[PDB]
JSON list of C-alpha atoms in Angstrom, two decimals:
[
{"chain": "A", "resi": 1, "resn": "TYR", "atom": "CA", "xyz": [-14.64, 13.14, -30.86]},
{"chain": "A", "resi": 2, "resn": "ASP", "atom": "CA", "xyz": [-12.09, 13.91, -33.53]},
{"chain": "A", "resi": 3, "resn": "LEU", "atom": "CA", "xyz": [-9.29, 15.55, -31.55]},
{"chain": "A", "resi": 4, "resn": "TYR", "atom": "CA", "xyz": [-6.75, 16.95, -34.02]},
{"chain": "A", "resi": 5, "resn": "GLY", "atom": "CA", "xyz": [-7.17, 13.95, -36.29]},
{"chain": "A", "resi": 6, "resn": "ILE", "atom": "CA", "xyz": [-7.30, 11.26, -33.62]},
{"chain": "A", "resi": 7, "resn": "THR", "atom": "CA", "xyz": [-10.63, 9.47, -33.86]},
{"chain": "A", "resi": 8, "resn": "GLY", "atom": "CA", "xyz": [-12.34, 7.90, -30.88]},
{"chain": "A", "resi": 9, "resn": "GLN", "atom": "CA", "xyz": [-15.18, 8.11, -28.41]},
{"chain": "A", "resi": 10, "resn": "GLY", "atom": "CA", "xyz": [-15.42, 8.40, -24.63]},
{"chain": "A", "resi": 11, "resn": "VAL", "atom": "CA", "xyz": [-15.75, 10.81, -21.71]},
{"chain": "A", "resi": 12, "resn": "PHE", "atom": "CA", "xyz": [-13.82, 13.95, -20.87]},
{"chain": "A", "resi": 13, "resn": "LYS", "atom": "CA", "xyz": [-12.79, 14.70, -17.29]},
{"chain": "A", "resi": 14, "resn": "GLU", "atom": "CA", "xyz": [-10.93, 17.93, -16.64]},
{"chain": "A", "resi": 15, "resn": "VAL", "atom": "CA", "xyz": [-7.95, 17.42, -14.33]},
{"chain": "A", "resi": 16, "resn": "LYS", "atom": "CA", "xyz": [-5.15, 19.94, -13.75]},
{"chain": "A", "resi": 17, "resn": "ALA", "atom": "CA", "xyz": [-2.25, 17.97, -15.17]},
{"chain": "A", "resi": 18, "resn": "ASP", "atom": "CA", "xyz": [1.40, 18.93, -15.48]},
{"chain": "A", "resi": 19, "resn": "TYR", "atom": "CA", "xyz": [4.67, 18.62, -17.41]},
{"chain": "A", "resi": 20, "resn": "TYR", "atom": "CA", "xyz": [3.46, 18.73, -20.98]},
{"chain": "A", "resi": 21, "resn": "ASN", "atom": "CA", "xyz": [6.63, 20.48, -22.01]},
{"chain": "A", "resi": 22, "resn": "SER", "atom": "CA", "xyz": [6.11, 22.41, -25.22]},
{"chain": "A", "resi": 23, "resn": "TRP", "atom": "CA", "xyz": [5.81, 19.95, -28.07]},
{"chain": "A", "resi": 24, "resn": "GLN", "atom": "CA", "xyz": [4.55, 16.87, -26.30]},
{"chain": "A", "resi": 25, "resn": "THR", "atom": "CA", "xyz": [0.77, 17.21, -26.16]},
{"chain": "A", "resi": 26, "resn": "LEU", "atom": "CA", "xyz": [-1.05, 13.87, -26.48]},
{"chain": "A", "resi": 27, "resn": "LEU", "atom": "CA", "xyz": [-0.74, 11.42, -23.60]},
{"chain": "A", "resi": 28, "resn": "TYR", "atom": "CA", "xyz": [-0.76, 7.83, -24.74]},
{"chain": "A", "resi": 29, "resn": "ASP", "atom": "CA", "xyz": [-0.69, 4.83, -22.44]},
{"chain": "A", "resi": 30, "resn": "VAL", "atom": "CA", "xyz": [1.43, 1.69, -22.71]},
{"chain": "A", "resi": 31, "resn": "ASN", "atom": "CA", "xyz": [-0.96, -0.02, -25.17]},
{"chain": "A", "resi": 32, "resn": "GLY", "atom": "CA", "xyz": [-1.29, 2.67, -27.84]},
{"chain": "A", "resi": 33, "resn": "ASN", "atom": "CA", "xyz": [-4.66, 3.88, -26.59]},
{"chain": "A", "resi": 34, "resn": "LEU", "atom": "CA", "xyz": [-5.26, 7.58, -26.07]},
{"chain": "A", "resi": 35, "resn": "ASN", "atom": "CA", "xyz": [-5.26, 8.27, -22.34]},
{"chain": "A", "resi": 36, "resn": "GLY", "atom": "CA", "xyz": [-4.79, 12.02, -22.14]},
{"chain": "A", "resi": 37, "resn": "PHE", "atom": "CA", "xyz": [-5.00, 15.16, -24.22]},
{"chain": "A", "resi": 38, "resn": "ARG", "atom": "CA", "xyz": [-4.07, 18.84, -24.23]},
{"chain": "A", "resi": 39, "resn": "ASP", "atom": "CA", "xyz": [-5.94, 21.38, -26.34]},
{"chain": "A", "resi": 40, "resn": "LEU", "atom": "CA", "xyz": [-3.72, 23.75, -28.29]},
{"chain": "A", "resi": 41, "resn": "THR", "atom": "CA", "xyz": [-6.24, 26.60, -28.27]},
{"chain": "A", "resi": 42, "resn": "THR", "atom": "CA", "xyz": [-7.01, 26.77, -24.54]},
{"chain": "A", "resi": 43, "resn": "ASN", "atom": "CA", "xyz": [-3.88, 25.41, -22.74]},
{"chain": "A", "resi": 44, "resn": "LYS", "atom": "CA", "xyz": [-6.14, 23.07, -20.75]},
{"chain": "A", "resi": 45, "resn": "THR", "atom": "CA", "xyz": [-5.80, 19.41, -19.82]},
{"chain": "A", "resi": 46, "resn": "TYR", "atom": "CA", "xyz": [-8.11, 16.39, -19.95]},
{"chain": "A", "resi": 47, "resn": "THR", "atom": "CA", "xyz": [-8.12, 12.65, -19.31]},
{"chain": "A", "resi": 48, "resn": "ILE", "atom": "CA", "xyz": [-10.09, 10.27, -21.48]},
{"chain": "A", "resi": 49, "resn": "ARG", "atom": "CA", "xyz": [-11.99, 7.13, -20.52]},
{"chain": "B", "resi": 1, "resn": "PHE", "atom": "CA", "xyz": [-8.28, -12.94, 2.06]},
{"chain": "B", "resi": 2, "resn": "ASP", "atom": "CA", "xyz": [-6.20, -10.14, 3.56]},
{"chain": "B", "resi": 3, "resn": "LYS", "atom": "CA", "xyz": [-3.09, -11.07, 1.59]},
{"chain": "B", "resi": 4, "resn": "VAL", "atom": "CA", "xyz": [-4.45, -11.66, -1.91]},
{"chain": "B", "resi": 5, "resn": "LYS", "atom": "CA", "xyz": [-5.96, -8.54, -3.44]},
{"chain": "B", "resi": 6, "resn": "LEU", "atom": "CA", "xyz": [-7.82, -10.15, -6.35]},
{"chain": "B", "resi": 7, "resn": "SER", "atom": "CA", "xyz": [-9.69, -12.76, -4.37]},
{"chain": "B", "resi": 8, "resn": "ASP", "atom": "CA", "xyz": [-13.00, -14.26, -5.46]},
{"chain": "B", "resi": 9, "resn": "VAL", "atom": "CA", "xyz": [-15.39, -11.85, -3.76]},
{"chain": "B", "resi": 10, "resn": "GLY", "atom": "CA", "xyz": [-12.99, -8.98, -4.48]},
{"chain": "B", "resi": 11, "resn": "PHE", "atom": "CA", "xyz": [-13.40, -9.22, -8.25]},
{"chain": "B", "resi": 12, "resn": "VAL", "atom": "CA", "xyz": [-16.89, -7.74, -8.39]},
{"chain": "B", "resi": 13, "resn": "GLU", "atom": "CA", "xyz": [-15.72, -5.09, -5.95]},
{"chain": "B", "resi": 14, "resn": "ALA", "atom": "CA", "xyz": [-12.88, -4.45, -8.38]},
{"chain": "B", "resi": 15, "resn": "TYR", "atom": "CA", "xyz": [-15.41, -4.28, -11.18]},
{"chain": "B", "resi": 16, "resn": "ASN", "atom": "CA", "xyz": [-17.71, -1.89, -9.34]},
{"chain": "B", "resi": 17, "resn": "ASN", "atom": "CA", "xyz": [-15.12, 0.89, -9.17]},
{"chain": "B", "resi": 18, "resn": "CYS", "atom": "CA", "xyz": [-14.74, 0.55, -12.95]},
{"chain": "B", "resi": 19, "resn": "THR", "atom": "CA", "xyz": [-18.08, 2.02, -14.02]},
{"chain": "B", "resi": 20, "resn": "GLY", "atom": "CA", "xyz": [-18.07, 5.24, -12.02]},
{"chain": "B", "resi": 21, "resn": "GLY", "atom": "CA", "xyz": [-15.10, 6.82, -13.73]},
{"chain": "B", "resi": 22, "resn": "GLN", "atom": "CA", "xyz": [-13.04, 7.37, -10.59]},
{"chain": "B", "resi": 23, "resn": "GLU", "atom": "CA", "xyz": [-9.38, 6.32, -10.13]},
{"chain": "B", "resi": 24, "resn": "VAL", "atom": "CA", "xyz": [-9.62, 4.41, -13.42]},
{"chain": "B", "resi": 25, "resn": "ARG", "atom": "CA", "xyz": [-5.94, 3.61, -13.83]},
{"chain": "B", "resi": 26, "resn": "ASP", "atom": "CA", "xyz": [-5.97, -0.10, -13.00]},
{"chain": "B", "resi": 27, "resn": "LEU", "atom": "CA", "xyz": [-5.82, -2.78, -15.65]},
{"chain": "B", "resi": 28, "resn": "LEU", "atom": "CA", "xyz": [-8.88, -4.83, -14.62]},
{"chain": "B", "resi": 29, "resn": "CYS", "atom": "CA", "xyz": [-11.35, -2.22, -15.83]},
{"chain": "B", "resi": 30, "resn": "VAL", "atom": "CA", "xyz": [-9.62, -2.20, -19.21]},
{"chain": "B", "resi": 31, "resn": "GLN", "atom": "CA", "xyz": [-10.08, -5.95, -19.63]},
{"chain": "B", "resi": 32, "resn": "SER", "atom": "CA", "xyz": [-13.83, -5.70, -19.07]},
{"chain": "B", "resi": 33, "resn": "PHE", "atom": "CA", "xyz": [-14.05, -2.97, -21.69]},
{"chain": "B", "resi": 34, "resn": "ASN", "atom": "CA", "xyz": [-12.92, -5.46, -24.33]},
{"chain": "B", "resi": 35, "resn": "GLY", "atom": "CA", "xyz": [-15.08, -8.35, -23.19]},
{"chain": "B", "resi": 36, "resn": "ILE", "atom": "CA", "xyz": [-12.49, -10.29, -21.24]},
{"chain": "B", "resi": 37, "resn": "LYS", "atom": "CA", "xyz": [-14.17, -10.16, -17.86]},
{"chain": "B", "resi": 38, "resn": "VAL", "atom": "CA", "xyz": [-13.84, -12.63, -15.05]},
{"chain": "B", "resi": 39, "resn": "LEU", "atom": "CA", "xyz": [-17.09, -14.21, -14.03]},
{"chain": "B", "resi": 40, "resn": "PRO", "atom": "CA", "xyz": [-17.94, -15.23, -10.49]},
{"chain": "B", "resi": 41, "resn": "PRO", "atom": "CA", "xyz": [-18.19, -18.97, -9.85]},
{"chain": "B", "resi": 42, "resn": "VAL", "atom": "CA", "xyz": [-21.45, -20.79, -9.16]},
{"chain": "B", "resi": 43, "resn": "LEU", "atom": "CA", "xyz": [-21.26, -21.10, -5.40]},
{"chain": "B", "resi": 44, "resn": "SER", "atom": "CA", "xyz": [-20.56, -17.96, -3.42]},
{"chain": "B", "resi": 45, "resn": "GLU", "atom": "CA", "xyz": [-17.51, -17.88, -1.22]},
{"chain": "B", "resi": 46, "resn": "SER", "atom": "CA", "xyz": [-19.80, -17.37, 1.75]},
{"chain": "B", "resi": 47, "resn": "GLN", "atom": "CA", "xyz": [-21.50, -20.65, 0.86]},
{"chain": "B", "resi": 48, "resn": "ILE", "atom": "CA", "xyz": [-18.34, -22.74, 0.63]},
{"chain": "B", "resi": 49, "resn": "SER", "atom": "CA", "xyz": [-17.21, -21.20, 3.91]}
]
């Protein structure tokens, strides 16, 4: 993938998340990995492994 | 074995939930993804018992 500039590879699993307020979109973990993502064109949520 | 979660036989059980992509929030599956995986010992724990 290349999600909005962020480069990486893995799976996508659609899970109905919550509380991505308005500006905060990309869900990082504690270690600076990408652990979750919101698309700006569909208002949908995902979780990356 | 009831008290300690990460016992000797429990490691490969903890590694088997890593591959499927379910409830992958624990830290042990992340360590195997970067090569630091615990190996089982030579004798099984059934054998020493």
